[PDB]
Every structure is written in structure tokens, then in C-alpha cells.
Write a protein that binds this ligand. Sequence first.
Ligand SMILES: CNc1ncnc2[nH]cnc12
Length: 210
Amino acid sequence: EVETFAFQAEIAQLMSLIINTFYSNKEIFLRELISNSSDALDKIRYESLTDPSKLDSGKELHINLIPNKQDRTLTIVDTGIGMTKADLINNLGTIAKSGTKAFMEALQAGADISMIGQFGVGFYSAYLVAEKVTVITKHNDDEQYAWESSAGGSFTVRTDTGEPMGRGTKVILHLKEDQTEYLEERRIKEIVKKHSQFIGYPITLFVEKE
Ligand SMILES: CNc1ncnc2[nH]cnc12
């Protein structure tokens, strides 16, 4: 059972702008997604301070980066608070409609695309490098779901049959054919050290057999 939804018009326009604008500094996508994971780990931590049973689904708090050259995917995994089905449908827990309107107003007044995170919609910078994004997520108060979109104005939500993750979110980037540099260990390391060196959770870069 798969359900299909239309993006609100402002989010559809934001995604088409990210996909079709000439902008060379694409590497900022990974900074924005690591920051999103850190915010979600802060949230489950705060809830656990008064109710430790919230970590019955997993006590480790971390971020993993997993490249796969055979599938041409780069995946970002966190053990944060996760998303309910309502959260996924509601623009992955963001205020994306008003955030877009601010981002547009800022771009006209001189800002550039790398400031996207200051408006609450940094998740959509994934489309600088991906042609499709799949999101797997599990919140303590709901079941495991998969969200997916290739842009084009719609997304799908379904109940996920894959491996149970316990609690958290997985962002799988199906990369554009000319953006494979972001599967290389040296390149990922460079980007993390430049943009994310003070994140307060351990970041582990997996390697491959090759
Ligand atoms: C983008 N929305 C998110 N909500 C909850 N956990 C996450 N981890 C990465 N992105 C998120």
C-alpha cells in the first residue's frame, strides 16, 4: 500500500530552483544534512532527561556516513528522535512553506544558496547532488515508514518492510551521474573537516570492500 501526495506549490518551486540553478558550491549539502541529524539527536536527548525510557529503543547517539559505489548512493544515518507519519507528510517536520518564502526574499536581497539552512529548509539541498531521495524513519510513537521523491511535484509514503532500525532516520541519496566524487573517502573527509568539525556527536565514515 503506497500513498502519493502533491508538494505544496512553494516547496515544488524551491525544489525546481535547487535543481535548475547554476551553482558550483554543491558540497554544502552534506553540512546541512549532518546539522539536521544533530538537531534530531539533541531532541531525543532532551526528552530522555525527564523520561529515560525514551532510550529503550537505543541508547547510542551517533551519526554514520555510508557510501556505496555499486548502488551509487550516499547514506546519512542518525539515532535521533525520528519522524511520525504526520511529520513526514508535513514536509519532514519543517516549516517549509514560510521558510521558502523567506529564502526567496533573501536571495533577491543578495544571499546565496549556501545560506539555505538559516531558513529551515536545508533538507532540500540534497537535490543539488541527488536525482532521487529515499528517507527511512522510526519514531517511538509510530511505526517505520519510507518516504521517496524524484522531484517532479509529488512524493510517496509507505510502511517500510526493511530491517527495523529501532529509532532514527536514514537519508539515502541516489546521486546524479556526474556527482560521484561524493562517494570518495578523501572527498567526504575533506568536507566533514571543513564544515562539521565541532558537531557534538561521533561521526563515523564507513569504508567499502572494493
Ligand atoms: C529533516 N527532518 C528530520 N527529522 C527528524 N530526524 C531527522 N534526521 C535528519 N533529518 C531529520
